[PDB]
């Protein structure tokens, strides 16, 4: 019962590589990639993780139905959308890419929500509002701050974990 978190890859074989690796050597079942994958070709990459896959979409990327498309090749279970509701592990997840705060905010306190993953570069946090659980991996690239983190959460124990790569 741990699900994969990360974001915002632009493009980085080598941490794109090195964060499946991490996601198949633990149980983990599913990846939440709120992404800024950037490249169509990165989703080849993910043909060696061993689970399903629910993305959102960033502001950078570009071929949007080609990367559906694509993921849906890896598996008819993936999923990708401008924002995402699923519940899993008996959890209300929503799911987005960290564009504007008035969308985390609703997401927040409507209470529909028990975990609001907010994917972007900026602002890694992983804290609990309201009875909402917050959380936001941070860069997987390490581009804009230099330390490149993914994230696994453990829904069983509501338990997070960053992990810089």
Same mark, same amino acid.
């Not at 890896?74 to 509701?85: A, G, K, P, V």
């Given at each position: 019962?741990?699900?994969?978190?990360?974001?915002?890859?632009?493009?980085?074989?080598?941490?794109?590589? $090195?964060?499946? %690796?991490?996601?198949? @050597?633990? #149980?983990? &079942?599913?990846? !939440?990639?709120?992404?800024?994958? +950037?490249?169509?070709?990165?989703?080849?990459?993910?043909?060696?993780?061993?689970?399903?896959?629910?993305?959102?979409?960033?502001?950078?990327?570009?071929?949007?139905? $080609?990367?559906? %498309?694509?993921?849906? @090749?890896? #598996?008819? &279970?993936?999923? !990708?959308?401008?924002?995402?509701? +699923?519940?899993?592990?008996?959890?209300?997840?929503?799911?987005?890419?960290?564009?504007?705060?008035?969308?985390?905010?609703?997401?927040?306190?409507?209470?529909?929500?028990?975990?609001?993953?907010?994917?972007?570069?900026?602002?890694?946090?992983?804290?609990?509002?309201?009875?909402?659980? +917050?959380?936001?991996?941070?860069?997987?690239?390490?581009?804009?701050?230099?330390?490149?983190?993914?994230?696994?959460?453990?829904?069983?124990?509501?338990?997070?974990?960053?992990?810089?790569?």
């Amino acid at each position: 019962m741990k699900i994969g978190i990360m974001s915002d890859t632009h493009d980085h074989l080598p941490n794109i590589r $090195k964060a499946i %690796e991490i996601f198949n @050597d633990e #149980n983990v &079942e599913t990846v !939440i990639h709120c992404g800024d994958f +950037v490249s169509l070709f990165v989703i080849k990459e993910f043909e060696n993780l061993n689970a399903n896959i629910i993305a959102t979409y960033g502001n950078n990327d570009g071929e949007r139905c $080609k990367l559906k %498309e694509w993921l849906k @090749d890896i #598996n008819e &279970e993936n999923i !990708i959308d401008d924002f995402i509701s +699923v519940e899993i592990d008996d959890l209300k997840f929503f799911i987005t890419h960290g564009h504007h705060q008035s969308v985390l905010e609703m997401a927040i306190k409507s209470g529909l929500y028990d975990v609001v993953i907010y994917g972007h570069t900026h602002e890694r946090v992983f804290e609990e509002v309201d009875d909402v659980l +917050v959380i936001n991996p941070g860069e997987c690239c390490g581009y804009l701050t230099g330390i490149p983190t993914i994230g696994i959460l453990d829904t069983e124990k509501k338990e997070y974990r960053e992990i810089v790569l």
